[PDB]
Design a protein around this ligand. Structure first.
Ligand SMILES: CCCCCCCCCCCCCCCCCC(=O)OCC(COC(=O)CCCCCCCCCCCCCCCCC)OC(=O)CCCCCCCCCCCCCCCCC
Ligand SMILES: CCCCCCCCCCCCCCCCCC(=O)OCC(COC(=O)CCCCCCCCCCCCCCCCC)OC(=O)CCCCCCCCCCCCCCCCC
Ligand code: HEA
Ligand code: HEA
Ligand SMILES: CCCCC/C=C\C/C=C\C/C=C\C/C=C\CCCC(=O)O[C@H](COC(=O)CCCCCCCCCCCCCCCCC)COP(=O)(O)OCCN
Ligand SMILES: CCCCC/C=C\C/C=C\C/C=C\C/C=C\CCCC(=O)O[C@H](COC(=O)CCCCCCCCCCCCCCCCC)COP(=O)(O)OCCN
Ligand SMILES: CCCCC/C=C/C/C=C\CCCCCCCC(=O)O[C@H](COC(=O)CCCCCCCCCCCCCCC)COP(=O)(O)OCC[N+](C)(C)C
Ligand SMILES: CCCCCC/C=C\CCCCCCCCCC(=O)O[C@H](COC(=O)CCCCCCCCCCCCCCC)COP(=O)(O)OC[C@@H](O)CO
Ligand SMILES: CCCCCC/C=C\CCCCCCCCCC(=O)O[C@H](COC(=O)CCCCCCCCCCCCCCC)COP(=O)(O)OC[C@@H](O)CO
Ligand SMILES: CCCCCC/C=C\CCCCCCCCCC(=O)O[C@H](COC(=O)CCCCCCCCCCCCCCC)COP(=O)(O)OC[C@@H](O)CO
Ligand SMILES: C[C@H](CCC(=O)O)[C@H]1CC[C@@H]2[C@H]3[C@H](O)C[C@@H]4C[C@@H](O)CC[C@]4(C)[C@@H]3C[C@@H](O)[C@@]21C
Ligand SMILES: C[C@H](CCC(=O)O)[C@H]1CC[C@H]2[C@@H]3[C@H](O)C[C@@H]4C[C@H](O)CC[C@]4(C)[C@H]3C[C@H](O)[C@]12C
Ligand code: CUA
Ligand SMILES: [Cu+2]
Ligand SMILES: [Mg+2]
Ligand code: NA
Lengths: 46, 259, 514, 79, 227, 84, 58, 79
C-alpha cells in the first residue's frame, strides 16, 4: 500500500522546501522557456 | 473490505503502453508519409496489438475468473458500449455529410453532374446487393446465437456464431475483390474519395467486429459464458448490428442513390 | 511503488493530480506563446519574421491553451478529483481506461511540439483551414503532426467522456436521483455528452484533410470536385460545441464557489441551473455557421444562424441572474476564490454580450476576422474559463493537498491578473471596430496606440503567472495543515478530510429513500 | 441588335452570393449554341448574349482553363 | 482608413455601412445597459449586512428574467434582419468587376466590354512616397465609378483570402473554385482602404486593397488608357 | 410492415434458426447466384485524361508513388493512360 | 472440450498478492517485458526521429 | 443539309418502351430553338431536326393540343 496524507499524495517531494523550489523552477521554467527556444530553432534554420 | 459492488481495478501498465503505442502509430504514419520508412509504424501496430490483447485478457480474468462483474459493474459496461457506439455513429456521420455535400451540388470540375463525368459506378444490383444480403443474414444468425446462449444450448450457439463469422469474412472477401475490380480509385476525385474512405472505414469496422465475434467464439468454446452472464457477447452483437446499419446507409446513399 | 502509483494508476485522485500538473505545465507554454504574440505586436514593424513564424506561434498558443491547459484542468483535473467524491463513489466506472485518457496527452503534446520543430511549422490558425493547410501551401510533416496531435487529444477526451457519463449515471447512491447531484457533476456530464458527439465529427474532418494531404483524395480540393467550405462546416460543427465544452465545467465550479462563499447551503434555482446547462448544450449544436458569415451563404441560412445564436443568451442569462440571486442575502466571505468568481460573473457577461453583437450576420460582415472577435473570446476564455479555473484552484487546493495557501498573496495575485487581462483585451475592441485584421504580424500605423497598451497588459499578466507559481511553492514550503472546513453538510467532497485517503467511500454513504 | 449591354443583369436562377453556376451555365450555353449554329449552317451572332454574360462574370483563368480543356478533349461538361 | 486612437467604426462611405453604424449604436447601448446593470447588481448584493440564507423560491422571478431578455433579443434581431435582407436586395449593377486573391496580392478584371486586367501589390515601406501610408498603399488601385451600383465578384487562385473594405461595409471571402458576389456603392469620391481578411500564409498582413472612386467620365478614360 | 410470415407467439432460438436457414441463407444463395452470373469483365472505356480524375498532388507512399493501393492494370489507367 | 473455468478461477484467486496482469504466471512477465521494451524503445526512437526531422538536410 | 431523314433514330436518353418524354422533349426543343432563332435574328432551319423528330413521334392530337395551349398562353412547359 501507498503513503497517505499531506505531502504524500503527490509525485514530487515537499520534504525540503529548497529542493522543492528547484523542482518547481525546472518544471514551470522548462514549460515557459520551450516556445522561446523553438522560435530560436526556427530562426536558426533559415 | 469494500461494502459497495464496484470494481477497484489493480494498477495496470496497459493504459501507458496503449498511449505510447498511439504515439508510435501516429509518429509512424508521419515517418511513412514523409520520410519513407515504416519502422515506427510497425512497432506501433505491434505494441497496440499487444496492449489490446493483454488489456482485454485482464478484463476476462477479472470477470470470468475473479468474479468482479457484479450487476452494477455490468450495467456500467452496458452504458460504456452504447456510448462508444454513439461516438462511432457520429464519426460516420461526418463522412456521410461529406458525401452528400459533394454529390448534391456537383461542381463544374466534375461536369456539374453526379456521378462525375468519367466515373462508371458499380452496379448496386450485383456484388453490393450480395454484400447487403450477407450482412443482413449475419444479423439473423447472430440473433439465433444469442437466443441459443440464453437457452443454454452450447452446440447451437457455436453453430450460429460460426455462421455469423463466416458471413462477415465472406463480406470482407467480397469487398476486397470489389476494391480490386473497381474501375475508379481513391484518387478519382471526390467520387473516389468519398467512396473509398467511407466504405474503407466501414470495412475496417467489419474486420474489428468479426475479430470481436471470433474472440467470443473462443471464449464460448472455453465455457466462459453462462446462460445469463455474457456481456462480451452482447457487446459484440450490438457492435455487429451497428456495422450492419452503417452498411445499409452506405448501400442506399453511395451505391444506390449516388449512382 | 512510484511507478505503480504514478504510471500504472487506477485511482481517480492521483489521475486528477496528474491532469492538474500537466495542465499547469501547459499553461506556462501557452503563456509564453501569448507573450511572443504580444511582443511581435508591441510596436510597429517586424520582430520575429513574417506571418509564417508568427502564425505558427498564434496557432500553437490556441491549441495549447484549449487542448492542453483548459480541458485537462477542468475535466481531467477537477472532474476526476471531484466527481467521484461529490456522488460518494469509490472511483470512476473505468479506472484503468481513465489512466489512458491521461497518458494520451503527453504524446499528443509531443506531436504538437514536433510539428513546430520540423519544416516551417504549421502556421494555419487553430482552425487549420485548407487549402492553406493543404500539401501544396503547407508541404511537409508539420500539418500532419498537428492533425495526429488532435487525434490523440480527441481519443483521450472521447474515452474520458464515456467514463464520466457512465460514472455519473451508474454510480450515485441508490436513493440519489439525477436531480440530487451537485451542479458541478451536472456540468461535467453535459460537457461529456458534447465531447462524445462533437469530437467524432472533428476526427472525420481532420482525417479527410489528412487523406487530401497524403492519399490524393480531394474532399476539399475543387480540382477533384471538392470544397474548402466543407471542411469549415465539419470543423465548426465540432468548434462551437467545443467552446461550450470549455465553459460548462467553469459554470459548474462557479455555482459551487458562489454558493459556498455566500454561506448558502444551496445555489438559487437548482432546477433552472440544470435546465440552463442542458439548453446551452443543446443549442450549441445548431449554431456553428455563425463562424462562416462571410463565406457566401444564402441570406435565409444567415438569418437562421443569427436567430438561433441569440437564443442561447436566454438560458445563459438565467445562470447569471441565479448566481447573483445566490449572493443575495448571503453572509459573504471575501476569500480569494470568491473574488475570482465575482470577476468571472462580470467579465463573462461582457464577453457573452459582445458574442451577441457578433451573432448578427449583418454586423459580422465588418467584425469578422478582426480583433473584435479576439476581444470577445478572450473575455469568455482568458477571463471566464481562466477565472473559473483560478477560483476552483484556490478553493479546492486545501482539499487536494491538505495545505492552505496564503490568502493575502492569493488576493494580490487576483488583483494583478485582473488589471493585466483587462488592459490586454479591452483595447482590442477598438482595434476590431476600426478594422485591424486577425492573424497579422504587423499593422498599419493608426493601430499603434491600442496595440502598444495591449502588449503592456500582457506583461502584467505574465507577472501574475509568475507570482502564482511562487504562491503554490510557499504553500507547500510552509506546510499549514488543514484542520476544519465549514459547510461540509452541503459539500460532500470535503467530508473525508484533507487530503482524503487514497480509497474513499469503501463503505458507501447511507441515503434513505423514504 | 437588341443589345447595348452594360453588364450581366440579375438572373433569378442565381440570386445568391455564390455565382459559380451562373458563370458556368452561360459558358456552357454559349458553347452549345455556337456548336449548334456552326453545325446546322447558321450564324454565331445569335449566341452573342451568352458570350457577353459569361465574359462579364467568369474569371479569365476559368475561361482559359475551360477553353484549353475543350481543345484537349477533357472538358467534363456536356457540349 | 482608420486614424490614430480610433474607438469605433471608420466613417460610412456607403448607405449600407451607415445602416450598420446606427444598428451598432442601438446594439451597443443594450450591451452597456446590461453589463452595467449586472455590475451594479453585483455591488448591490455585496454591500449589506442583512441576510436571508434559507430556501428562496424561483418559479416567479425566472419568468421576468426569461421574458425580458427574450424581448430584448427580438429588439436586436428585427433591425439586424432588416439590414441583412436589404444587403441581399436585387439592385442591378451598371458594372461588374472581378478580383482574384493570390498569394500575396490581388488581381482585378474589368471584362464587361474590354479585356482589362492587372495585379495590385502593396508598395514596400522602403518605396513609399512622402505622406503615403505604410502597409496600405498599392501600385495599381481599383478605379471605380462613384455613386454607381457595382457588382464585385471575388475568388482566389490558390489559398483562401478575404476581400474587405471596412468603410464600405464589405468583406467577401475569396475561395478557389467559387465565385462570391457582393455589391459596392460609394456615396463619395476618394480613396478607400482594406486588407486581406483570411490567413493566407507568409504575407497575409501585406496584401491591401485600395479603391479609387471617381466620376463616371474619369472612370471611362481610365478604362481606355489601361488597355 | 408485418412481413408475410407469422410466428410471434414467442420468438426464441428455434425461430431464429428457422429464419437463418429458411430465409437468410437462401437469400444469400440467390444473390450469390445473381452475382456470379452478371459478372463478366466489362469492356474498359476509352481513356480520357480528365483533370478531375487520377489526382496526384503528392506521390503515394508506396511503389513508384504513381500507382493506387489496389491498382488493377486491366481497369485503372495511370494519369498518362492504361498500362502495357 | 471440457469446462476448466473452475481451475482458472482457483489460479486467479490464489492469494499471492500479484496484480491481475501477472497472475497468470511467468509468461505474463515475459509478454509484459516485451510490450514495455518495445514501447519505451520505440518512444526513444521516435524522439531520435523528431530530432532528425527538426533539422534541414538542405 | 446533313439530313435525308427516314425516321427518328434510337435515342440513348429514351431507350425504354415508354416514349412519352422523347416526343415531349423534342417538341420543347424545337419550339425553344425556333424562339431563339426568330428572336436573335437567325434562321429556323437549324431547328429542323427537332421538328422532324417530334413530328415523327408525337401523336397529332398531342401536338395539336400543345400548339393550342402555347397560343392560349396555357402551355405548362418552359419555352
Ligand atoms: C517536462 C517536466 C519538467 C521536469 C522537471 C522535474 C525534474 C525532476 C528531477 C528528478 C529528481 C528526483 C526527485 C524525486 C522526487 C520529486 C521529483 C519527481 O519525482 O519528478 C517528477 C514528478 C514531479 O514533478 C516535479 O519535478 C515538480 C513539479 C512541482 C509541481 C507543483 C505544482 C503546483 C500546482 C498544483 C498542482 C496540482 C496538485 C496539487 C494538489 C495535490 C495533489 C492531490 O512528476 C511526474 O513524474 C508526473 C508528472 C506528469 C505530467 C506533468 C506534465 C508533463 C508534460 C510533458 C509533455 C511533454 C511534451 C514534450 C515537451 C518536451 C520539451 C521540449
Ligand atoms: C485601457 C484602455 C483605455 C481606453 C480608454 C478609452 C478612451 C476614451 C477616449 C474618449 C474620446 C471620446 C470621443 C470618441 C467617441 C466616438 C464614439 C464611437 O463611435 O466609438 C464607439 C466605441 C467606443 O465606445 C465609447 O464611446 C467609449 C466607451 C468606453 C467604455 C470604457 C469602459 C472602461 C472600463 C475601465 C477599464 C476597462 C476594463 C473594464 C472592462 C469593462 C467591460 C468592457 O464602442 C465600442 O465598441 C468600445 C467598447 C465595446 C464593447 C465593450 C462593451 C462592454 C462595456 C462594459 C462597461 C462596464 C462599465 C463599468 C466600469 C468597468 C469596471 C471595470
Ligand atoms: C468560453 C468560450 C466561448 C463561449 C462561452 C462563447 C460564447 C458565445 N459566442 Fe463566441 N467564440 C469563442 C469562444 C466562446 N464564445 C471563440 C474561441 C471564438 C472564435 C473562434 C475562432 O475563430 O478562432 C468565438 C467566436 C464567435 C462568433 C464568430 C465571430 C466571427 O468569427 O466573426 C460568434 C458569432 O456569433 C460568437 C457568438 C457567441 C455567443 C452569442 C455566445 C453566447 O454563448 C454568449 C451568451 C451570454 C450572454 C449574452 C451574457 C450573459 C447573459 C445575460 C446577462 C442575459 C441578458 C442578455 C441579453 C438580453 C442579450 N462567438
Ligand atoms: C483558453 C484559451 C486562451 C487563453 C487563456 C488565451 C490567453 C491569452 N491570449 Fe489568446 N488565443 C486563443 C485562446 C486563448 N488565449 C485562441 C483560440 C486564439 C486564436 C488562434 C488563431 O487565430 O488561430 C488566440 C489568439 C490570440 C491573439 C490574436 C493573434 C492574432 O490574431 O494574430 C492574441 C493577441 O494578443 C492573444 C493573446 C493572448 C494573451 C496575451 C493571453 C493571456 O491572457 C494569457 C495569460 C496567462 C494565462 C491566463 C494562463 C494561466 C493559466 C495557467 C498557467 C494554469 C495555472 C495552473 C493551475 C491553476 C493548476 N491570443
Ligand atoms: C446519415 C446517417 C449517418 C450514419 C448512421 C449510422 C448508423 C445508425 C445508428 C444506430 C444503429 C446501431 C446499433 C443498434 C443496436 C444496439 C444498441 C444498444 C442498445 C441496447 O440494446 O441497450 C438496451 C436498451 O436500453 C437503452 O436504450 C438505454 C438508453 C441509453 C443510455 C446511455 C445514453 C446516455 C447519454 C445521455 C442522453 C441524453 C438524453 C436525456 C433526455 C434529454 C435530451 C433532450 C440495454 O441497456 P442498458 O444500458 O442496461 O439500459 C437500461 C435501460 N433498460
Ligand atoms: C478491404 C476492405 C477494408 C478496408 C481497409 C483495408 C486495407 C487498407 C489499409 C488501411 C485502411 C483503414 C481505414 C481507411 C483509411 C483510408 C482509405 C482506405 C480505403 C481503401 O482501402 O481504399 C483503397 C485505397 O487504399 C489506400 O490508399 C490505402 C492506403 C493505406 C493507407 C492507410 C492510411 C491510413 C490513414 C489512417 C488515418 C487514420 C486516422 C484514424 C482516426 C480514427 C479516429 C481518431 C482503394 O483502392 P484504390 O486502388 O484507390 O481503388 C481501387 C482500384 N482498383
Ligand atoms: C435583464 C433582466 C433581469 C432584471 C431584474 C430581475 C430582478 C427581480 C426583482 C425582484 C424579485 C421579487 C421576489 C419576491 C419574493 C419576496 C422576498 C421575501 O421576503 O423572501 C421570502 C419569500 O420566499 C421567497 O419567495 C424566496 C425569497 C426571495 C425570492 C426571490 C429573491 C431573489 C431575487 C433576485 C435577487 C437579485 C438578483 C436579480 C437579478 C437581476 C420571505 O418569506 P415570508 O415572508 O413568507 O416568511 C417570513 C416569515 N413571516 C411570514 C413572519 C414574514
Ligand atoms: C436531423 C435534425 C432535424 C432536421 C432540421 C434541419 C437540420 C439538419 C438537416 C439534415 C438534412 C438536410 C439535407 C437537406 C439538403 C438541402 C440543402 C442542400 O442542397 O445543401 C447541400 C449540402 O447539404 C448537406 O450536405 C446536408 C448534410 C448534413 C448537414 C446538416 C448537419 C446535421 C448532421 C449531424 C447531426 C447528428 C445526428 C446523428 C444522426 C444519427 C449543398 O449545398 P448548397 O448550400 O445547397 O449549395 C448550392 C450552391 O451551389 C448555390 O448556393
Ligand atoms: C486483425 C484486426 C485487428 C484490429 C484492431 C481491433 C481488433 C479487435 C477489436 C475487437 C476487440 C475485442 C474485444 C475483446 C473483449 C474481450 C473482453 C470482454 O468481452 O470482456 C467482457 C466485458 O466486456 C467488455 O469489457 C467490453 C469491451 C469492449 C471492446 C470493444 C471495442 C471495439 C474496439 C474498436 C477500436 C477501433 C476504433 C475504430 C477506428 C476509427 C467480460 O465480461 P463477460 O463477457 O460478461 O464475462 C463474464 C462472465 O464470464 C461471467 O460468468
Ligand atoms: C493512428 C491514428 C489514431 C490512433 C489512436 C489510437 C488510440 C489508442 C490505441 C490503444 C487503445 C487500445 C487498448 C484497449 C482499450 C480498452 C478500454 C476498455 O475496454 O475499457 C473498458 C471500458 O470502456 C468500455 O467498456 C466502453 C468502450 C470500449 C472502448 C474501446 C477502446 C478503443 C480505442 C480507440 C477509440 C477511437 C474512438 C472512436 C470514435 C471515432 C474496460 O474498462 P477498464 O477501466 O479497463 O476496466 C474496468 C473493469 O471493471 C473491467 O473488468
Ligand atoms: C466440439 C464442440 C461440441 C461441444 C464441446 O466442445 O464439447 C462442437 C459443437 C459445435 C461446434 C461446431 C459447429 O457445428 C459449427 C462448425 C461447423 C463445422 O462445419 C466446422 C466446425 C464448427 C466450427 C464447429 C466445431 C465443433 O468442434 C464444435 C465446437
Ligand atoms: C419543469 C422543470 C422542472 C421542475 C421540477 O421538477 O422541479 C422546470 C425547471 C426549470 C423551468 C424553466 C426555467 O425556469 C426557465 C423558464 C422560466 C419561465 O418562468 C417559464 C418557462 C421556463 C422554460 C421554465 C419551465 C419549467 O418550469 C422548468 C423547465
Ligand atoms: Cu491573403 Cu490573407
Ligand atoms: Cu460558435
Ligand atoms: Mg474568415
Ligand atoms: Na509586429
Amino acid at each position: 500500500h501507498y503513503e497517505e496524507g499531506p505531502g504524500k499524495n503527490i509525485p514530487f517531494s515537499v520534504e525540503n522546501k529548497w529542493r522543492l523550489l528547484a523542482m518547481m523552477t525546472l518544471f514551470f521554467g522548462s514549460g515557459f522557456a520551450a516556445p522561446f527556444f523553438i522560435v530560436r530553432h526556427q530562426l536558426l534554420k533559415k | 473490505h469494500q461494502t459497495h459492488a464496484y470494481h477497484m481495478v489493480n494498477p495496470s501498465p496497459w493504459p501507458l503502453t496503449g498511449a505510447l503505442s498511439a504515439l508510435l502509430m501516429t509518429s509512424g504514419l508521419t515517418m511513412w508519409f514523409h520520410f519513407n520508412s515504416m519502422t515506427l509504424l510497425m512497432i506501433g501496430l505491434t505494441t497496440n496489438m499487444l496492449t489490446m490483447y493483454q488489456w482485454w485478457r485482464d478484463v476476462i480474468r477479472e470477470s470470468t475468473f475473479q468474479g468482479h462483474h457484479t450487476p452494477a459493474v455490468q450495467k456500467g459496461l452496458r452504458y460504456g458500449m452504447i456510448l462508444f457506439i454513439i461516438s462511432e455513429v457520429l464519426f460516420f456521420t461526418g463522412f456521410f455529410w461529406a458525401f452528400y455535400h459533394s454529390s448534391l451540388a456537383p461542381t463544374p470540375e466534375l461536369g456539374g453532374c453526379w456521378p462525375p463525368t468519367g466515373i462508371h459506378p458499380l452496379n448496386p444490383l450485383e456484388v453490393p446487393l450480395l454484400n447487403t444480403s450477407v450482412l443482413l443474414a449475419s444479423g439473423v444468425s447472430i440473433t439465433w446465437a444469442h437466443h441459443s446462449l440464453m437457452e443454454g444450448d452450447r452446440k447451437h450457439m457455436l453453430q450460429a456464431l460460426f455462421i455469423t463469422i463466416t458471413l462477415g469474412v465472406y463480406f470482407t472477401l467480397l469487398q476486397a475483390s470489389e476494391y480490386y475490380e473497381a474501375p475508379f480509385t481513391i484518387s478519382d476525385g471526390v467520387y473516389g474519395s468519398t467512396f473509398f474512405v467511407a466504405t474503407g472505414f466501414h470495412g475496417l469496422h467489419v474486420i474489428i467486429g468479426s475479430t470481436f465475434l471470433i474472440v467470443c467464439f473462443f471464449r464460448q468454446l472455453k465455457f466462459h459464458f453462462t446462460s445469463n452472464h455474457h456481456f462480451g457477447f452482447e457487446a459484440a452483437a450490438w457492435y455487429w448490428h451497428f456495422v450492419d446499419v452503417v452498411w445499409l446507409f452506405l448501400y442506399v446513399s453511395i451505391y444506390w442513390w449516388g449512382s | 511503488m512510484f511507478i505503480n502509483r504514478w504510471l500504472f494508476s487506477t485511482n481517480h485522485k492521483d489521475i486528477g493530480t496528474l491532469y492538474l500538473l500537466f495542465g499547469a505545465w501547459a499553461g506556462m507554454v501557452g503563456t509564453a506563446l501569448s507573450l511572443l504574440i504580444r511582443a511581435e505586436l508591441g510596436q510597429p514593424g517586424t520582430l520575429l519574421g513574417d506571418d509564417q513564424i508568427y502564425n505558427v506561434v498564434v496557432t500553437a498558443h490556441a491549441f495549447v491553451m484549449i487542448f492542453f491547459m483548459v480541458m485537462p484542468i477542468m475535466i481531467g483535473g477537477f472532474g476526476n478529483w471531484l466527481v467521484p467524491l461529490m456522488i460518494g463513489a469509490p472511483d470512476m466506472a473505468f479506472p484503468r481506461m481513465n489512466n489512458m485518457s491521461f497518458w494520451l496527452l503527453p504524446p499528443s503534446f509531443l506531436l504538437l511540439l514536433a510539428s513546430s520543430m520540423v519544416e516551417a511549422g504549421a502556421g494555419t490558425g487553430w482552425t487549420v483551414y485548407p487549402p492553406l493547410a493543404g500539401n501544396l501551401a503547407h508541404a511537409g510533416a508539420s500539418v500532419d503532426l498537428t492533425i495526429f496531435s488532435l487525434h490523440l487529444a480527441g481519443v483521450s477526451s472521447i474515452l474520458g467522456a464515456i467514463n464520466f457519463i457512465t460514472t455519473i449515471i451508474n454510480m450515485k447512491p441508490p436513493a440519489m436521483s439525477q436531480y440530487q447531484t451537485p451542479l458541478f457533476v451536472w456540468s461535467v456530464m453535459i460537457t461529456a455528452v458534447l465531447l462524445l458527439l462533437s469530437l467524432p465529427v472533428l476526427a472525420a474532418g481532420i482525417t479527410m484533410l489528412l487523406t487530401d494531404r497524403n492519399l490524393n483524395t480531394t474532399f476539399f480540393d475543387p480540382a477533384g470536385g471538392g470544397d474548402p467550405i466543407l471542411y469549415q462546416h465539419l470543423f465548426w460543427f465540432f468548434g462551437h460545441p467545443e467552446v461550450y465544452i470549455l465553459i460548462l465545467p467553469g459554470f459548474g465550479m462557479i455555482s459551487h464557489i458562489v454558493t459556498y462563499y455566500s454561506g448558502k447551503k444551496e445555489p438559487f434555482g437548482y432546477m433552472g441551473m440544470v435546465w440552463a446547462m442542458m439548453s446551452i448544450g443543446f443549442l450549441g449544436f445548431i449554431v456553428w455557421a455563425h463562424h462562416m458569415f462571410t463565406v457566401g451563404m444564402d441570406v435565409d441560412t444567415r438569418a437562421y444562424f443569427t436567430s438561433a445564436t441569440m437564443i442561447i443568451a436566454i438560458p445563459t442569462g438565467v445562470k447569471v441572474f441565479s448566481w447573483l440571486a445566490t449572493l443575495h442575502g448571503g453572509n459573504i466571505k471575501w476569500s480569494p476564490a470568491m473574488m475570482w468568481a465575482l470577476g468571472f460573473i462580470f467579465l463573462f457577461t461582457v464577453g457573452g454580450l459582445t458574442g451577441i453583437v457578433l451573432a448578427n450576420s449583418s454586423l459580422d460582415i465588418v467584425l469578422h476576422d478582426t480583433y473584435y472577435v479576439v476581444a470577445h473570446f478572450h473575455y469568455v476564455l482568458s477571463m471566464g474559463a481562466v477565472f473559473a479555473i483560478m477560483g476552483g484552484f484556490v478553493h479546492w487546493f486545501p482539499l487536494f493537498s491538505g495545505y492552505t495557501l496564503n490568502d493575502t498573496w492569493a488576493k494580490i495575485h487576483f488583483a494583478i491578473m485582473f488589471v493585466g487581462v483587462n488592459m490586454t483585451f479591452f483595447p482590442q475592441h477598438f482595434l476590431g471596430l476600426s478594422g485591424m485584421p486577425r492573424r497579422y504580424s504587423d499593422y498599419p500605423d493608426a493601430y499603434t496606440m491600442w496595440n502598444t497598451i495591449s502588449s503592456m497588459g500582457s506583461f502584467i499578466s505574465l507577472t501574475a503567472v509568475m507570482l502564482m507559481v511562487f504562491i503554490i511553492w510557499e504553500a507547500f514550503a510552509s506546510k499549514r495543515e488543514v484542520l476544519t472546513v465549514d459547510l461540509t453538510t452541503t459539500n460532500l467532497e470535503w467530508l473525508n478530510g484533507c487530503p482524503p485517503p487514497y480509497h474513499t467511500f469503501e463503505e458507501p454513504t447511507y441515503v434513505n429513500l423514504k | 441588335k437588341i443589345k447595348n449591354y452594360q453588364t450581366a443583369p440579375f438572373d433569378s436562377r442565381f440570386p445568391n452570393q455564390n455565382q459559380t453556376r451562373n458563370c458556368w451555365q452561360n459558358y456552357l450555353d454559349f458553347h452549345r449554341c455556337e456548336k449548334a449554329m456552326t453545325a446546322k449552317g447558321g450564324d454565331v451572332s445569335v449566341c452573342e448574349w451568352y458570350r457577353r454574360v459569361y465574359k462579364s462574370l467568369c474569371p479569365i483563368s476559368w475561361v482559359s482553363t475551360w477553353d484549353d480543356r475543350r481543345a484537349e478533349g477533357t472538358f467534363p461538361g456536356k457540349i | 482608413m482608420a486614424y490614430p486612437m480610433q474607438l469605433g467604426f471608420q466613417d460610412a462611405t456607403s448607405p449600407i455601412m451607415e445602416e450598420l453604424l446606427h444598428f451598432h449604436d442601438h446594439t451597443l447601448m443594450i450591451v452597456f445597459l446590461i453589463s452595467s446593470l449586472v455590475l451594479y447588481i453585483i455591488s448591490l448584493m455585496l454591500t449589506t449586512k442583512l441576510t436571508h440564507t434559507s430556501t428562496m423560491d424561483a418559479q416567479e422571478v425566472e419568468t421576468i428574467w426569461t421574458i425580458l431578455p427574450a424581448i430584448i433579443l427580438i429588439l436586436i434581431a428585427l433591425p439586424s434582419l432588416r439590414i441583412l435582407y436589404m444587403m441581399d436586395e436585387i439592385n442591378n449593377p451598371s458594372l461588374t468587376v472581378k478580383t482574384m486573391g493570390h498569394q500575396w496580392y490581388w488581381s482585378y478584371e474589368y471584362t464587361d466590354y474590354e479585356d482589362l486586367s492587372f495585379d495590385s501589390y502593396m508598395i514596400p515601406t522602403s518605396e513609399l512616397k512622402p505622406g503615403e501610408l505604410r502597409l496600405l498603399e498599392v501600385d495599381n488601385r481599383v478605379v471605380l465609378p462613384m455613386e454607381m451600383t457595382i457588382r464585385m465578384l471575388v475568388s482566389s487562385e490558390d489559398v483562401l483570402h478575404s476581400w474587405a473594405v471596412p468603410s464600405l461595409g464589405l468583406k467577401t471571402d475569396a475561395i478557389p473554385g467559387r465565385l462570391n458576389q457582393t455589391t459596392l456603392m460609394s456615396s463619395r469620391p476618394g480613396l478607400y482602404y482594406g486588407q486581406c481578411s483570411e490567413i493566407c500564409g507568409s504575407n497575409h498582413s501585406f496584401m491591401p486593397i485600395v479603391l479609387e472612386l471617381v466620376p463616371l467620365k474619369y472612370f471611362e478614360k481610365w478604362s481606355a488608357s489601361m488597355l | 410492415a408485418s412481413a408475410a410470415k407469422g410466428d410471434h407467439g414467442g420468438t426464441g432460438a428455434r425461430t431464429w434458426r428457422f429464419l437463418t436457414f429458411g430465409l437468410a441463407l437462401p437469400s444469400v444463395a440467390l444473390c450469390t447466384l445473381n452475382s456470379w452470373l452478371h459478372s463478366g469483365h466489362r469492356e474498359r472505356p476509352a481513356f480520357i485524361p480528365y483533370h478531375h480524375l487520377r489526382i496526384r498532388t503528392k506521390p503515394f507512399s508506396w511503389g513508384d508513388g504513381n500507382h493506387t493501393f489496389f491498382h488493377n492494370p486491366r481497369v485503372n489507367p495511370l494519369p498518362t493512360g492504361y498500362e502495357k | 472440450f471440457e469446462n476448466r473455468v473452475a481451475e482458472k478461477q482457483k489460479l486467479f484467486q490464489e492469494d499471492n498478492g500479484l496484480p491481475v496482469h501477472l497472475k497468470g504466471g511467468a509468461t505474463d512477465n515475459i509478454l509484459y517485458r516485451v510490450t514495455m521494451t518495445l514501447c519505451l524503445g520505440g518512444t526513444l526512437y521516435s524522439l531520435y526521429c523528431l530530432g532528425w526531422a527538426s533539422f534541414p538536410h538542405k
